[PDB]
Amino acid sequence: ENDVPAILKEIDSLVSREAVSAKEVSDAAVALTYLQVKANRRLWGKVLEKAGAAQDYDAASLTNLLWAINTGGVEHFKTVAELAGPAVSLLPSLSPVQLSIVVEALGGAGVKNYELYNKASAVVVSKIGEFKPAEIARVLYGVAFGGVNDVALAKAAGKVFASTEVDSRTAAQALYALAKLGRADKATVDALLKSFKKGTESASDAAAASFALGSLSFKAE
């Protein structure tokens, strides 16, 4: 009654039929990260085959898919970069918590879409109180790793990181985004280095703030 490989075979038969919609391919991907299925690559490949084939996309299934691609650590540039087509079409339709997930997923994959990050930064610099500071670091990680040197966002992000104290995972994403932009504004880095005293539950953000400091050469804290 608790079967992980027998539920992988029932996900495998869900995405191997002929007309898988957007919601069924999104939730098959969400179920593969919560189950932590790095060992089975073909089952992750059958999901991203149907993720490019799916033609409907609402705001909810696109962000559940792109969360599962980014969190699961699954990389396919052709599939993810063509999911930026739904994203620029659903861009006013997205919640601010949903727009932070698509830009952090399309940015972290390296999707070169200047029309996406221009309009997705314009909704952060227009509605900046609407965005939680964890959602500003997600957009900042996206626009930086998507190849856009948008310093109009990097200034508006620093005004939030000095006004609200942020999470350790929020700050280390914001440090990693500023390290690729190569900015090293000590008025903003030191506002994010005070978030690393409550302890860090992940090693992956202590390692990423480590990388982001040395790339700007601040010092170890």
Partner: protein, 61 residues
Amino acid sequence: DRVLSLPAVSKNQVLENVFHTAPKAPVEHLEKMVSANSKVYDALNLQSKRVLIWQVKPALF
């Protein structure tokens, strides 16, 4: 001249004007469309041994 009272059109010229074209067989449409749909089966089925689905939309392993 009794031969000029016979019908001048031959028995040959009747048989070549009555049976002018070789008629189309009933099974000729079956065995020509079946051999052409056996190529629709082969390329496009997902149970055929020579499907095009792996050389048209390759895979993701």
